[PDB]
Write a protein that binds this ligand. Structure first.
Ligand code: MG
Ligand code: MG
Ligand code: MG
Ligand code: MG
Ligand code: MG
Ligand code: MG
Ligand code: MG
Ligand code: MG
Ligand code: MG
Ligand code: MG
Ligand code: MG
Ligand code: MG
Ligand code: MG
Ligand code: MG
Ligand code: MG
Ligand code: MG
Ligand code: MG
Ligand code: MG
Ligand code: MG
Ligand code: MG
Ligand code: MG
Ligand code: MG
Ligand code: MG
Ligand code: MG
Ligand code: MG
Ligand code: MG
Ligand code: MG
Ligand code: MG
Ligand code: MG
Ligand code: MG
Ligand code: MG
Ligand code: MG
Ligand code: MG
Ligand code: MG
Ligand code: MG
Ligand code: MG
Ligand code: MG
Ligand code: MG
Ligand code: MG
Ligand code: MG
Ligand code: MG
Ligand code: MG
Ligand code: MG
Ligand code: MG
Ligand code: MG
Ligand code: MG
Ligand code: MG
Ligand code: MG
Ligand code: MG
Ligand code: MG
Ligand code: MG
Ligand code: MG
Ligand code: MG
Ligand code: MG
Ligand code: MG
Ligand code: MG
Ligand code: MG
Ligand code: MG
Ligand code: MG
Ligand code: MG
Ligand code: MG
Ligand code: MG
Ligand code: MG
Ligand code: MG
Ligand code: MG
Ligand code: MG
Ligand code: MG
Ligand code: MG
Ligand code: MG
Ligand code: MG
Ligand code: MG
Ligand code: MG
Ligand code: MG
Ligand code: MG
Ligand code: MG
Ligand code: MG
Ligand code: MG
Ligand code: MG
Ligand code: MG
Ligand code: MG
Ligand code: MG
Ligand code: MG
Ligand code: MG
Ligand code: MG
Ligand code: MG
Ligand code: MG
Ligand code: MG
Ligand code: MG
Ligand code: MG
Ligand code: MG
Ligand code: MG
Ligand code: MG
Ligand code: MG
Ligand code: MG
Ligand code: MG
Ligand code: MG
Ligand code: MG
Ligand code: MG
Ligand code: MG
Ligand code: MG
Ligand code: MG
Ligand code: MG
Ligand code: MG
Ligand code: MG
Ligand code: MG
Ligand code: MG
Ligand code: MG
Ligand code: MG
Ligand code: MG
Ligand code: MG
Ligand code: MG
Ligand code: MG
Ligand code: MG
Ligand code: MG
Ligand code: MG
Ligand code: MG
Ligand code: MG
Ligand code: MG
Ligand code: MG
Ligand code: MG
Ligand code: MG
Ligand code: MG
Ligand code: MG
Ligand code: MG
Ligand code: MG
Ligand code: MG
Ligand code: MG
Ligand code: MG
Ligand code: MG
Ligand code: MG
Ligand code: MG
Length: 275
RNA sequence: CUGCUGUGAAUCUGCCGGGACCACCCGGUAAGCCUGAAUACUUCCCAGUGACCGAUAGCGGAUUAGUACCGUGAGGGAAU
RNA sequence: UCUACCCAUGGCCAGGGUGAAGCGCGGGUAAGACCGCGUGGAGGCCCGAACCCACUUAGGUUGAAGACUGAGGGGAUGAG
RNA sequence: GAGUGAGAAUGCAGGCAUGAGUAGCGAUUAGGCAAGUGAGAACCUUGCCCGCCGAAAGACCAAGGGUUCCUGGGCCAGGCCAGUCCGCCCAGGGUGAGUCGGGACCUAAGGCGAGGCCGACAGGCGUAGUCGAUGGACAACGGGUUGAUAUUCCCGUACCCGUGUAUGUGCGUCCAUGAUGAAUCAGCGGUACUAACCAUCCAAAACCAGGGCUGCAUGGGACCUUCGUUGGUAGUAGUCAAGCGAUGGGGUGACGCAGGAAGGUAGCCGUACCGGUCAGUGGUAAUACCGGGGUAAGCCUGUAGGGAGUCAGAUAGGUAAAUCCGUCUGGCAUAUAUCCUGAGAGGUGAUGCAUAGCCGAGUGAGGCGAAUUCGGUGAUCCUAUGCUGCCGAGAAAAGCCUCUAGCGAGGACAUACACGGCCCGUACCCCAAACCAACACAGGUGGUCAGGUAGAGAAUACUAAGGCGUACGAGUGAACUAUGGUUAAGGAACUCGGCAAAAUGCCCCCGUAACUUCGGGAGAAGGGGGACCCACAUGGCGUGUAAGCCUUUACGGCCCAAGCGUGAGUGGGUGGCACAAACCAGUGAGAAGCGACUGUUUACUAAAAACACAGGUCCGUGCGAAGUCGCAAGACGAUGUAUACGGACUGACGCCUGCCCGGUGCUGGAAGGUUAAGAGGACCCG
RNA sequence: AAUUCCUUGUCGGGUAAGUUCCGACCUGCACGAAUGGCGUAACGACUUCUCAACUGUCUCAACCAUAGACUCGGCGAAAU
RNA sequence: UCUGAUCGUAUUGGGCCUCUAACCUCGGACCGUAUAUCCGGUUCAGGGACAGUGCCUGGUGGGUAGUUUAACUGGGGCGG
RNA sequence: AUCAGCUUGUUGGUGGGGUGAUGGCCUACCAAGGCGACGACGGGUAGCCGGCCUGAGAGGGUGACCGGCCACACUGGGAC
RNA sequence: CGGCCAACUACGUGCCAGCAGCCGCGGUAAUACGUAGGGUCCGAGCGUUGUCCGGAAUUACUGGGCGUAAAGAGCUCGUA
RNA sequence: GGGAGACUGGAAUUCCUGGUGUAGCGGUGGAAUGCGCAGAUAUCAGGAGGAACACCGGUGGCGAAGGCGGGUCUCUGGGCAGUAACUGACGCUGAGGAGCGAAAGCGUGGGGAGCGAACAGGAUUAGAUACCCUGGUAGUCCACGCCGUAAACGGUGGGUACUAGGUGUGGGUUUCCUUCCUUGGGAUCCGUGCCGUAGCUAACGCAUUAAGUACCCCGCCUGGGGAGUACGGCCGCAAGG
RNA sequence: UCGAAGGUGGGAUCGGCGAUUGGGACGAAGUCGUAACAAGGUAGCCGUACCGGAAGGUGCGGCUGGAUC
RNA sequence: GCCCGGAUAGCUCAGUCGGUAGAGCAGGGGAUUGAAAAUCCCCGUGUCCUUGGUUCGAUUCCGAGUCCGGGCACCA
RNA sequence: GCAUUC
C-alpha cells in the first residue's frame, strides 16, 4: 500500500512513501550482488548525452534472471521478497531444489513460501514461466521475450502486464502495456501474472530533495534560456518560445520511429494517442 | 588528361591521336617494367670574400642566452 | 592546479529546543471509529558556534587587498 | 654608392628632472627600566616588571617549499628607520627504521591498452591485461640522549616475516594395520521382438428402400528379447589412511543514514600521605599557605556488552571434482547450556624507568631522592563494522578460512642456539615574513590534540601550559576625517526610505487572538520572579566504602551508616540606584503585492517578483527504443522496458481552466493537379 | 492592477495636512483562464503602507578617547 | 498482307506471392580461450533479395556557415 | 442551548482560628472530589406575597392603594 | 343611527372634499361624506387612545389536530 | 431478483481486418447540417471491447427503507408453517445518538461500446441561448472513500386488542370426497390485491392490510408571504446539508 | 496580609454608523418575452448537475398530484 | 503633427468602367385578425460631406477644406 | 409543420 506522511513540515506535506508491506528481508543475497556506479548521464567521451542525471544514492545491482530457461522441471520456493533500487518492481529470491538461488521480478500476489515451476509442463499460476506456445490465450503475462532465448524485455515495470490475445502459426499476438498490438514467436518465454508493487505510481515524492536522492537533476525550461542555448530562448519578459515547439536541438514535435523498420512486419497496430 | 559509379570491345580489314562530329589522309602502336647526365637544396665540415654591421647596430644571443625572468601550459623572452 | 557540472573514495557539522510515524497502556464499543497518558525520536524542523554564504551599512577607492576590512545579516542533518 | 639630416607619431631604449625632502613606513596587543655587548643600540643579549593570544597568536602533520635547520663568522646589498640582529651573506656540520608514512601487497573512479573492431591518411574506441589511494590487508611501546635526528640512535621490555644447524616427540612411502566398493556365471518377474487373446472405433467393396464380412487404428495381459531380483567367485585383484595444497569451487573480507540508552576509560576536581614557605602590612607557625600525590605496548585473566542451534542421511546446483557451500528430509535442543567476540577492572611488565624537592657548584653538568591512598566529576574517546529505527536501500580486490583437483617419500610440531630482514621519506617552516598571494602583503590553506573558573556550549569574559609584544619612532588637548563613548528637553519633526544608531535579548513560571492545509500561527501578544545569609536540612536526589544479608563462592547479587557531589522549593532576615548583575543575549504588532515552501543565480555594482522545486498536462519512444555524443565502430539512455525513458509548457494546495482548426505547425489519407534521375528513342540535323 | 495613457480618475478609510497605502466603483488607452485565471494557511536579509517601543536621524549641537592629520629625527615614492 | 478481334511459341519491361543461396541479426550453443557481455570462426534458430552501404536523383533543411540589408537629409530615425 | 460543559476553597476529611450559633465561614496540611440535558455554567428580564383584573371553570394577565416580608438610602468600600 | 348593533329621512358637494374597527362607503339622484330635522343608547358624564383578560376549543389539563387543508422524521437500531 | 465475492454465457450496438459490391446512405412534419464516391450504406466471414441482461416476467416474489432479474459456485441475513422440547414478562416505544440511505455530484486510480448535461453546427421562428436533426465532452461502468438529499409517497410513525362478508393471488399446514384423477371441496396460519357493511370523514374517500372502536411511546402542526432565507453554530474537499 | 477607586494589557460579548453591494415587499396605464393553468400547444412537479437576458432549457433518477388510447 | 483608409435613402451597408444610383430594416396604403404583433401584396424615399478644377458629361478622375476611423510622433 | 399578446 501507500503510507501518507503527516504535514509536519512544508517538505512533507502531501508526500507519501511505499508501506514496503511485501518486503520480507532487508538485505540482498551477497552472492547475487554486483557493483554499480553512477554515470551522471555521461558517455564514453565524458560528454553529457542524457541531461538531468547524477547525484543519486549509491546502489548495488541484483542479478535478475530474465532468461529462466535452464531449470525446466526443477521447482523453486519463494524464499524472500525484497526491495530493488534499480527498478520499480520488487524482486523475489527463489530457492531451487537444485540448491541454486536466483532473483526474479516479483509478480502480483506472489507470497513467501509459494512454489514456482518452469517449462512446458508448468501450471498456469502466477510466477510460473513457460513458452507462449503452452500459455492459453486470454491469460495475463509479464516479462516476455522478444526473440527465443533473448531474455525477458517487455512488461517488467511495477503493475504492468501483457494480454496474450491469440496464436496463429508461429506467432502469438500480444497487447502491450502501451496498447500496441504486436506479434512475437510462440517459442518465446513468458511469466504468468502481472508485475507486483502496482501502487508505487501513486507515491507523491513531496520535495525536490527526494528526486535528487533518486538521481534526477533539475530541468531548466527552454523559454528561460538565451537564443544561443535553446531555440525557445530569448525575448523580453515571458514568452511562449516564439515558434512551434522544438527540442533543444531544433527537432520539431513529431513521429520519431524510423520508417520501414523490420519490426514493422510484426506490429499489427500502433498505440492510440488521446483515446 | 584523370578519380569514383554503372555499362562494356576488337588483335592489324585491329585499335588510339591530329580541339565537337563524319569521311579521307597523316602520325603512333595503350592497357608490363627499369634507366645515368643536364635541374633543386645545405643541418653539418673546410678555404675564402664584402663601396656588409661595429655593442640601442649586427643573430634574440660579442658578456653563464634560448640563460635570468614571465606563464599551469603551449609559449614569450631580456640586460651587461 | 581558477571556475561550472559530474565520477570514485575519505572527512566534518559545539551546545540547546520541538516532539511525526510506530509501539505499549488505560478510557470507549457488540467489534470499531475515535479520545486521553506514556514510550518513541521523525524533519530539504527550530535557536545557535565551527564551517559554508555575501543581505544592509560605514571604511577602503596611487587600498593592508587587481574585490578586502569592521559592524550587524543568512544557511548551519542537507538539493549540506 | 647611400641604413644621408627629427621636435613632435598618447613613438622606442637609456639616463635624469617636476610633484618633494611631500604621501606613506601595512592593523584591530604596549611597552618600561636596569645591566651587558659594541665604533655606533627605541629595535641585539640577559634580568626584573607590564601587556596580549590561550578551539590560539599553543602543540603535531599532510600539500607545497628546498637547507630556510645547527655551530662559527659577517654587516657597503636586502629588512619600508637603525642594527652589534635576521627567515639576508659566507664556511663547515646536520636527516640513522623488519614495526612510523609509501613501494616490493590489493583493488575504486579513471588512465593506458597485446591481439581486435571501426576509420581515405591522421586517428577513434576497446577485450585480455596492466597501472591508478582519497579506501582494504599487514609486526612497537615507554624512557633517555645531541648544538642540530629519533616509535629511526641508546636503555628496558615486545611483536612480525624468512634462513641454517642441533635435540626431542609423535606421524610413513616398502614392510604392514584398518577400511571399504565393482565385473561376471547361475536360480527368479514385466519390458516385450513376434504369431495370436480381449474390449472398442471406422467402411473400401458395398446389399436394400437398416444388415454382414474383411482389413485399419487405439488401450490391457502374454512367448522371444532385454532390464531388473538373489546365490557363487570378487576384499581375488584394485582403491583409500603422513603431510603440502591451488591461478580452480565455496564462505568471509563487505560497508548507508539517523537515534539514543547503558557500561567504561582518558581528562579534570578534591583527599590520606609526603616535601616545603613566612612573601618586612591589622591578623596569621601550622590549624594557614605552596609544590608533589607518576609510569606504555606486550603478556596473563575473560567481566559489562554483542553474536550465534547441532548431528545424521541424500545431492552433482556451485563452467572438472568435493567430506566445503547451497538445497531437501530426519533425530536431539530452549538451557546464564556451550562456544565465538569484546570495552574496562585486576595481575604482570616495573628491585626498573620517571618525579616534588635537596646537595654543592655554574659552561651548566653531575649525584642523592619522599609520599604515591581513597573519593567525586566526566567525555565529541572506547565496547560499536554493536544495538534500535528508517528509505533514498548503502565499492572492489587482495588477504584469511575451507573444499577437493593435483602434488607426495619423506613429513608435521615443539624447544635451544646462530643468523637475514631490501628500496624511498625522515633536517626545518607548515593558519605562515619559509606554501598560494609580483612585497617580510589585514586575503587564502585539509587533518590531528582540546587545561581551569563562570557558562547549555568548541559561544563569551578572565586565565594555566605554551607562545607572543610582528621590524619606523618620539611628541603634541588645532581644524578636518576615521573608530568608539556620553547627552538636558523633545522623540522620526530627519530622509527617497527609521539609512545608521537606539531598543528587545537569559532562565523559571503565568498567559496567549484572527486565521488555518488542523501540522501550525507561537518565543504570538502581555505579565511576574531572579542577589547574598540563615533555617527547614545529620532532609531530598546521585554515587557508594565499612558493617550486614543472599548465593549459582566469583572479575557474583542485595542493602548500605560514613565520605564526596548536587539541585529545586518554602519561611525569615540582610545590602544597593540597580541582583539576567560585566561579557553574552529575539524588537513587537496591523495590512497589501509577488513567489507556495527549504534551496539556486550575474567570481568583481543586480540575490530578486528571476531559476529550481514537489504537483499537472501534452507529445515522442515496443527496445544495441526515442534522444544525445561520434565520419564510423561504439557509448550514454539502462545492466532500465510504457507505473519506463526523452522532450515541451505549467509550477504546493483549493475552486476552476470557456469559444475559434480560417492562418502556420504536427498527425493521418491519397481521388484529382503538378513533379527528378532512370527507362524509352518517333521525328529531325551533320 | 508589478497592467489605467488621460490621472493626483471618483467615492470611502487612515493623517492637523496622504500624487504613496488600504476598501470600493468600471469610462479594462492596452486583464483573463496551464507564455494558466482567481484565491490561499505557512514561509521571505523581496517590495509597499500604518502603529507601539526606542533613540543625536532630526530641532541643534556639545564634550571625551584613540588612529591619521600637525611638530621633530630616519627612510622615502606617485599620478601630472 | 492491310480497317480490326484473337490465341500459343520467343524477346522484353511493371506489380504481386513465395523460395534460399548473397546479405543481415546486440537471438542460442560451441571453439580460438587458463583468463574474455571485445573480436573472429563453426553451427543451430530467425529475417531476406528487403534492409544496410556506393553512385546518380527530387524533396525537407536558421540545425549550421558565408554574407547582404542604398543614398539624399538644416544630427539621425520616421515621412518624402 | 443560535448558552454544553462548569468548578481548585472547588468537593470531602483532620488539627487550629472565628461566631451568639452550625458550617470552607477562615486557615494549614491530606484525599480527588462536587454540580450538569430532572438544563449545570452563561445571557435577558424582574423585588416576592396576601391579593387584584378577567374568566363558566381550568386558566391567562398583574402586584397601584391597603397589609406582611426583603432590598437600598449621591456612587463604591469599611468598620465603630 | 349600512351590517354586527338599538336608532332614517331631506339638502350640500360626485372617486373630490372626506369616512372607516372589519367588510367596505364618495364617479352630479349617498339611510356610510358634511350639515339639518328626527331617532337611539348612556347621563354629570359621554366618547377616543393605550393596556390586560374574554369572545379565541386560536397552545385545546378541562378542551384541537397531522391521506388530499399547516402537520408522520427517508428507513432502522438503540441510550436516558 | 434479500446481501457480498469470484468465475463465466449468448443476442445486439460500435470499431477493426478481409471478401462481394456499387452510388448513394442517413435523417424529418418537411428539410438541412452529417457520412460517402479516396470505395459508404448493404451483405458475408474473422477479430477486439464495453455496457445491459430479450423470452420467463405479473399491478407475482424478497428486503427496514433506499432497493433487488443471464448462469454457476462460495460465504451470509431475514421470513413463514408445524411441534410445544426450553427460558419465564426477559415486553413495547424511544428525546438525544449511531448505522443504512435512489439519482445527481465530489476525490484518487482504472475503464469507456452504447447513451449523453455542457458544447458545436442544421432546421424551425419575429427571435429560438429550446422542442426536432447531425455530432459530441464530463458523466453513466469498475475499485476505494466522501456527500446524506428525492413527489426517499400509501403524500397515511411504531406496538397491541377488537369490530358483516364476498372474491382473486403468493407461502405453509391439515379433514372430507375419492377416481384417489386432483385448481375436488372444507378448516386453519402467514403475506399480497380488488369489492363492499357497520363506523368514520368537509367532501373525495377509508373500510379486519382502517382514515373504524380503544390503550402505550415517539415525531410533527398552530394564517399566507418574507423563509427552510439571514445571522450564529455544527458537518463537508466542494457543491451544499 | 486582605482591600475600594485608579493605571496597564490582551481578549469576550451587545449594539450604532459605513463608500460599495445582496436580495425582499409594495407601487400607475413602462420594456422584453410567454414559463405555468386545457394534452397550456415539449404533461407537470421533486432531488441534483450544467447552461441561458428573463421566465426557463437539457441530462440522470423519481412521483401522478398526467390528458388521449 | 506624419502616413493611410473613409464620408451614398430615416438607420446599417453594396455599387464605380466618366453615361447607373441599388439591398435588408424602417416608413406609407392595402390584405389577414374581434383587435394588436408576426406574416402576405402594392408604393414612396438620394448636392452620393463640402469645395473648386479637368471633361460634351463627375457618386466615379484630380487638388483643397470640415468631420471620423486606423498605424505612427522616436535616440540621447 | 407552425399559431405571441389583450
Ligand atoms: Mg573512458
Ligand atoms: Mg529530463
Ligand atoms: Mg525498487
Ligand atoms: Mg509520479
Ligand atoms: Mg524546470
Ligand atoms: Mg535570462
Ligand atoms: Mg537558434
Ligand atoms: Mg511582454
Ligand atoms: Mg503517454
Ligand atoms: Mg579525337
Ligand atoms: Mg619509374
Ligand atoms: Mg659606444
Ligand atoms: Mg644586441
Ligand atoms: Mg595565461
Ligand atoms: Mg615556472
Ligand atoms: Mg533546518
Ligand atoms: Mg556564490
Ligand atoms: Mg582615501
Ligand atoms: Mg562579517
Ligand atoms: Mg542575531
Ligand atoms: Mg534570523
Ligand atoms: Mg541557525
Ligand atoms: Mg534526519
Ligand atoms: Mg635615416
Ligand atoms: Mg633627439
Ligand atoms: Mg621623446
Ligand atoms: Mg626631486
Ligand atoms: Mg604638497
Ligand atoms: Mg602634509
Ligand atoms: Mg604623514
Ligand atoms: Mg609594521
Ligand atoms: Mg643602555
Ligand atoms: Mg620596537
Ligand atoms: Mg587576556
Ligand atoms: Mg637560524
Ligand atoms: Mg644562522
Ligand atoms: Mg653571530
Ligand atoms: Mg646593513
Ligand atoms: Mg637599513
Ligand atoms: Mg579499469
Ligand atoms: Mg583504449
Ligand atoms: Mg594495437
Ligand atoms: Mg599499484
Ligand atoms: Mg591511502
Ligand atoms: Mg628539532
Ligand atoms: Mg555487498
Ligand atoms: Mg605580620
Ligand atoms: Mg592494565
Ligand atoms: Mg618512589
Ligand atoms: Mg622533525
Ligand atoms: Mg613570499
Ligand atoms: Mg600574511
Ligand atoms: Mg574551556
Ligand atoms: Mg573565543
Ligand atoms: Mg611582518
Ligand atoms: Mg608604529
Ligand atoms: Mg585631537
Ligand atoms: Mg537626548
Ligand atoms: Mg532624557
Ligand atoms: Mg517626515
Ligand atoms: Mg522634511
Ligand atoms: Mg514620502
Ligand atoms: Mg537598521
Ligand atoms: Mg545597536
Ligand atoms: Mg503573527
Ligand atoms: Mg533599598
Ligand atoms: Mg521564493
Ligand atoms: Mg529555516
Ligand atoms: Mg531562501
Ligand atoms: Mg555581482
Ligand atoms: Mg550583491
Ligand atoms: Mg513530470
Ligand atoms: Mg538510435
Ligand atoms: Mg506542447
Ligand atoms: Mg512559470
Ligand atoms: Mg503532411
Ligand atoms: Mg489614485
Ligand atoms: Mg482620499
Ligand atoms: Mg486599490
Ligand atoms: Mg497576459
Ligand atoms: Mg485555454
Ligand atoms: Mg495559455
Ligand atoms: Mg504563475
Ligand atoms: Mg536573500
Ligand atoms: Mg596622534
Ligand atoms: Mg619627517
Ligand atoms: Mg534495396
Ligand atoms: Mg546566420
Ligand atoms: Mg570574407
Ligand atoms: Mg545617410
Ligand atoms: Mg531631418
Ligand atoms: Mg523612410
Ligand atoms: Mg473545629
Ligand atoms: Mg428593577
Ligand atoms: Mg374560556
Ligand atoms: Mg337595528
Ligand atoms: Mg384559550
Ligand atoms: Mg384579543
Ligand atoms: Mg384545528
Ligand atoms: Mg395519527
Ligand atoms: Mg399538506
Ligand atoms: Mg414514512
Ligand atoms: Mg464489488
Ligand atoms: Mg469493407
Ligand atoms: Mg459491414
Ligand atoms: Mg428502538
Ligand atoms: Mg430521533
Ligand atoms: Mg451515482
Ligand atoms: Mg465538476
Ligand atoms: Mg468519478
Ligand atoms: Mg476518472
Ligand atoms: Mg455513508
Ligand atoms: Mg426532505
Ligand atoms: Mg421510491
Ligand atoms: Mg414526507
Ligand atoms: Mg396505528
Ligand atoms: Mg389476507
Ligand atoms: Mg371499500
Ligand atoms: Mg382524516
Ligand atoms: Mg416561505
Ligand atoms: Mg440553508
Ligand atoms: Mg452561515
Ligand atoms: Mg450603505
Ligand atoms: Mg406556455
Ligand atoms: Mg408545457
Ligand atoms: Mg411551443
Ligand atoms: Mg400539466
Ligand atoms: Mg441547452
Ligand atoms: Mg425523466
Ligand atoms: Mg528610451
Ligand atoms: Mg407585451
Amino acid at each position: 500500500g501507500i503510507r501518507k506522511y503527516k504535514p509536519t513540515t512544508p517538505g512533507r506535506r502531501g508526500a507519501s512513501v511505499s508501506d514496503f508491506a511485501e518486503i520480507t528481508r532487508s538485505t540482498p543475497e551477497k552472492s547475487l550482488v554486483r557493483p554499480l556506479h553512477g554515470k551522471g548521464g555521461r558517455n564514453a567521451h565524458g560528454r553529457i548525452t542524457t541531461r538531468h542525471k547524477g547525484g543519486g544514492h549509491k546502489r548495488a545491482y541484483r542479478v535478475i534472471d530474465f532468461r529462466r530457461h535452464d531449470k525446466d522441471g526443477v521447482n523453486a520456493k519463494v524464499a524472500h521478497i525484497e526491495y530493488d533500487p534499480n527498478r520499480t518492481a520488487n524482486i523475489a529470491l527463489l530457492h531451487y531444489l537444485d540448491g541454486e538461488k536466483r532473483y526474479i521480478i516479483a509478480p502480483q500476489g506472489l507470497k513467501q513460501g509459494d512454489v514456482i515451476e518452469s517449462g512446458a509442463n508448468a501450471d498456469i499460476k502466477p510466477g510460473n514461466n513457460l513458452p507462449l506456445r503452452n500459455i492459453p490465450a486470454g491469460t495475463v503475462i509479464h516479462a516476455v521475450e522478444l526473440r527465443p532465448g533473448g531474455g525477458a524485455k517487455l512488461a517488467r515495470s511495477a503493475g504492468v502486464s501483457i494480454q496474450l490475445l491469440g496464436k496463429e502459426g508461429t506467432y502469438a499476438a500480444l497487447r502491450m502495456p502501451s496498447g500496441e498490438i504486436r506479434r512475437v514467436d510462440v517459442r518465446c518465454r513468458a511469466t504468468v501474472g502481472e508485475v507486483g508493487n502496482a501502487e508505487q505510481s501513486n507515491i507523491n515524492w513531496g520535495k525536490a530533495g527526494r528526486m535528487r536522492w533518486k538521481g534526477k537533476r533539475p530541468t531548466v525550461r527552454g523559454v528561460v534560456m538565451n537564443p544561443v542555448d535553446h531555440p525557445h530562448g530569448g525575448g523580453e519578459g515571458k514568452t511562449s518560445g516564439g515558434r512551434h515547439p522544438v527540442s533543444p536541438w531544433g527537432k520539431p514535435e513529431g513521429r520519431t520511429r524510423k520508417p520501414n523498420k523490420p519490426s514493422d512486419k510484426l506490429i499489427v497496430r500502433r498505440r492510440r494517442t488521446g483515446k
